[PDB]
Design a protein around this ligand. Sequence first.
Ligand SMILES: O[C@@]1(CNc2ncnc3[nH]ccc23)CCCSC1
Ligand SMILES: [Cl-]
Length: 167
Amino acid sequence: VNSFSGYLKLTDNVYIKNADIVEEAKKVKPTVVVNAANVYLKHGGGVAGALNKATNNAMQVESDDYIATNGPLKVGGSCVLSGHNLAKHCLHVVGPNVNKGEDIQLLKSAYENFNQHEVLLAPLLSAGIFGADPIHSLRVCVDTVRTNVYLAVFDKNLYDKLVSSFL
Ligand SMILES: O[C@@]1(CNc2ncnc3[nH]ccc23)CCCSC1
Ligand SMILES: [Cl-]
């Protein structure tokens, strides 16, 4: 039993809710919140921009030190950093950005990072400003993640379509 509330159950381990991931994380304080990161951990917009703003830019400061030490992530890769005031940990995961021409096949590799964590609060990878089809992202999530994932979908209209079209 966990403290996630109000989700629809899609499978044994995948759940979904119309919610602002920032407001969700502040309420639940999950062990792991997933950020929709880029390889430079530059959290300018989208989910990343919103999560960073909620940390008062502390996420960005920590991320800049991480990059200065380690260099960029790989597309499909991840790193674990602090969750600041939102969660214990933030798993920064880089899905392919279609608007940069990145290979959508890497979306499965991106979701594989979730399997290293027993429970996660997460957005749909490569959705929104990363330009992939969110129905596809949900399919890849369900077919790749085996740990317990609670998906927050900000847009109510998109949330309704994801449920009604789910196979
Ligand atoms: O959910 C999205 C990604 N974007 C966000 N998700 C959750 N919380 C958020 N807060 C700010 C942005 C944001 C992908 C599925 C279709 S709708 C957009
Ligand atoms: Cl977005």
